[PDB]
């Protein structure tokens, strides 16, 4: 059936945080609908496709965002129903704190149209990069600030906390000259109750423009009541609340499994200094002198032709659509391929492609069945 | 001081999920070190820079990953100390479940070298896109599978759960022909204890190649004990555990704030059908007929010259380095700019650039001080 919806992301920082697949899908679209913040990103998008509509114009002063989101979602779905390949574009990751993307895809899917979200770089992705933390260590709780308050969502003092939309507590509507965020104090009360007055809170704003610096300003929970401080929080403000303490390891679980890493989390309070070059680190580095690639390591051993075609499949959605519809047909027609390369394409599976592109050791192969 | 480290990401899916800034930083690097999974991504990177080293060769059978990670981290830092601009490349987001990137940057930073992480598209970013969920609704807990078990990290039955590295419970080492994951049953016990035998668990593997489909296979916690099922879990397997129930809203917090959305989370058990086109949705859509852009909406009104230069700053790290060192000097030298465009560049701040690129309403401006 004719018509499809693909939602892509631009990332947070202007132009540069758009993925290659996002860009190519924008170029290939019959109709593009975008919701971005900065106008360089907007201008960039307009150079890539003739038929763009700015979804930002469906916001308004005193207008409930649900109305705006229904309207955005419907404008996309309508062009899908005319049989068109529609691309929606949202800043960051198009599915991370975004109603109208999930909305438009579920509608498109429930009426039997091809409906896909491509992931992008979120504000949380930026937060991790800019504040130098890893969700894995010591885990990550991520909430919308108001949902956190309204359903009294549990915090963990032993894991990362990320709070989106701290700049609009309780606000269901929109205003072009922002809002006061009068209910901010309500969040600040919940934070003090759960973490305490002296506990650190990092005010995070990712640079939007290539030349700008992030905001990574640490405050105490209590400092967030100072008018001068509270007023710096806005619509693109995210809070990071580090853990209060390391959590004791579990004796019972260590047994069944038959059993700090550098660097320390710098935003953590009373964080001990961690040594980079412990013995096992010094021993690991001494080994580099005599290091050879292990036997089962498989070096790249591919051709310009196979490199070019695997790039095309990733970057040229027309090349991909042929391939997807008949592997063997597509492979036969690619010029300057070795039989081993053609065969790998005909099969499509990751192993075959790895064998054709990598010089596989006799060992790995053996494994087989 | 001479020498810098920039760590970038490739995203998960081959080539296409690399950001434009990642690609340009790879091109500009004196020395590139990469750790990617698929060889098309690897071959792509090698076309972009002469001086690449594959970090994957510092893994080995029976070799502790801490050794591998120290070695990766040291190879990068050493070229930084020779005064070189070093780019590290890791698949996905270079800071999400990645020791050696955080490690190499903290060392580079602690010795006074420029040290930056650019964010990328993580496996969790892909999970949200592919399984059609939003962390915001109803919140997200993200853990490394073993850390989850070892520190007995709290679950929330009312929020999303994402578990990384479910394919290597308790395993500190590496093997080129994978592992059995014998301690898997230990995780399956923790899940049953917290969620129950019938509770859904989604086996998520993001397609690595453009033509492939994700794995989005739902199982019961109890089904994960079947050998045939358990054996499908591997080193690139992530678990998504949806909520067991919606959490009652808090009466007290609703008051202080002076107060389902479509679509439903499809992986949630006994999930009720949600209506897309309720009255407020129908009323929102009726308004589209007479919709004009509001007064305070500010249309793009920019030039090829300003579009081109704002693109260059995002895509050409040399253009950016000039600009960063002398705004006014850089602006003066850009050809075919209006005074308003030159002025915006000289100031650098987002407002000035927005005024130069957008046709700002007399209203927004008024706000001012």
């Amino acid at each position: 059936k004719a018509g499809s919806l693909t939602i892509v992301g631009t990332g947070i920082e202007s132009i540069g945080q758009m993925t290659l697949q996002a860009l190519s899908y924008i170029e290939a679209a019959a109709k593009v609908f975008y919701c971005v913040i900065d106008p360089a990103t907007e201008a960039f998008i307009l150079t890539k496709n003739k038929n763009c509509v700015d979804l930002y114009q469906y916001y308004d002063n005193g207008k409930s965002r649900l109305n705006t989101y229904t309207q955005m979602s419907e404008l996309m779905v309508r062009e899908v129903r005319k049989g068109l390949d529609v691309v929606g574009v949202f800043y960051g990751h198009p599915g991370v704190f975004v109603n109208p993307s999930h909305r438009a895809l579920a509608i498109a899917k429930s009426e039997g149209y091809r409906a896909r979200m491509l992931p992008g770089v979120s504000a949380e992705d930026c937060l991790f990069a800019d504040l130098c933390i890893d969700p894995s260590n010591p885990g990550c709780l991520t909430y919308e600030a108001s949902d956190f308050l309204i359903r009294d969502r549990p915090v963990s003092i032993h894991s990362h906390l990320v709070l989106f939309q701290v700049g609009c507590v309780g606000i269901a509507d929109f205003n072009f000259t922002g809002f006061d965020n009068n209910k901010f104090g309500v969040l600040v009360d919940r934070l003090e109750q759960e973490y305490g007055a002296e506990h650190p809170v990092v005010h995070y704003i990712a640079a939007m423009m290539p030349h700008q610096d992030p905001v990574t300003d640490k405050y105490t929970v209590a400092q967030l009541r100072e008018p001068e401080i509270a007023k710096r929080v806005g619509g693109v403000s995210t809070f990071y609340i580090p853990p209060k303490a390391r959590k004791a390891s579990n004796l019972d679980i260590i047994r069944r499994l038959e059993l700090r890493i550098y660097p320390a989390n710098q935003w953590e309070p009373d964080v001990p200094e961690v040594e980079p070059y412990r013995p096992s680190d010094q021993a690991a580095i001494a080994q580099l002198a005599d290091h050879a690639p292990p036997e089962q390591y498989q070096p790249l051993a591919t051709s310009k032709a196979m490199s070019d075609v695997m790039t095309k499949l990733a970057l040229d959605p027309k090349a991909l659509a042929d391939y997807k519809a008949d592997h063997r047909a597509f492979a036969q027609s690619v010029p300057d391929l070795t039989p081993q390369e053609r065969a790998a394409l005909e099969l499509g599976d990751s192993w075959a492609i790895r064998c054709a592109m990598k010089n596989m050791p006799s060992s790995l192969l053996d494994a087989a069945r | 001081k001479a020498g810098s480290l920039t760590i970038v990401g490739t995203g998960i899916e081959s080539i296409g999920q690399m950001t434009l800034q990642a690609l340009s930083y790879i091109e500009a690097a004196a020395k590139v070190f990469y750790c990617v999974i698929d060889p098309a991504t690897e071959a792509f990177i090698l076309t972009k820079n002469k001086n690449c080293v594959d970090l994957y060769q510092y893994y080995d059978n029976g070799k502790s990953r801490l050794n591998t990670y120290t070695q990766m981290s040291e190879l990068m830092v050493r070229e930084v100390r020779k005064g070189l601009d070093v780019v590290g490349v890791f698949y996905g987001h270079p800071g999400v479940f990645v020791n050696p990137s955080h490690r190499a940057l903290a060392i580079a930073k602690s010795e006074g070298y420029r040290a930056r992480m650019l964010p990328g598209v993580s496996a969790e970013d892909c999970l949200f896109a592919d399984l059609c969920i939003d962390p915001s609704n109803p919140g997200c807990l993200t853990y490394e599978a073993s850390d989850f078990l070892i520190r007995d990290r709290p679950v929330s039955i009312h929020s999303h759960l994402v578990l990384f590295q479910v394919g290597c419970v308790g395993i500190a080492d590496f093997n080129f022909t994978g592992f059995d994951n014998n301690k898997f049953g230990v995780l399956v016990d923790r899940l049953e204890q917290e969620y129950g035998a019938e509770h859904p668990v989604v086996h998520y593997i993001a397609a690595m190649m453009p033509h492939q489909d994700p794995v989005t296979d739902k199982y019961t916690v109890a089904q994960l004990r079947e050998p045939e099922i358990a054996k499908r879990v591997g080193g690139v397997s992530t678990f998504y555990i949806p909520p067991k129930a919606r959490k009652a809203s808090n009466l007290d917090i609703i008051r202080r704030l002076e107060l389902r959305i479509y679509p439903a989370n499809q992986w949630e058990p006994d999930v009720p059908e949600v209506e897309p086109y309720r009255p407020s949705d129908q009323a929102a859509i009726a308004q589209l007929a007479d919709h004009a852009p509001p007064e305070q909406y500010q249309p793009l009104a920019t030039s090829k010259a300003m579009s081109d230069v704002m693109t260059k700053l995002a895509l050409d790290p040399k253009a950016l380095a000039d600009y960063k060192a002398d705004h006014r000097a850089f602006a003066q030298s850009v050809p075919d700019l209006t005074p308003q465009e030159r002025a915006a560049l000289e100031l650098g701040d987002s407002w000035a650039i927005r005024c130069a690129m957008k046709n700002m309403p007399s209203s927004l401006l008024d706000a001012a001080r």
Partner: peptide, 12 residues
């Protein structure tokens, strides 16, 4: 200069 592009709301 107060950018506000919120693309989600919660029950209220």
């Amino acid at each position: 200069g107060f950018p506000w592009v919120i693309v989600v709301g919660v029950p209220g």
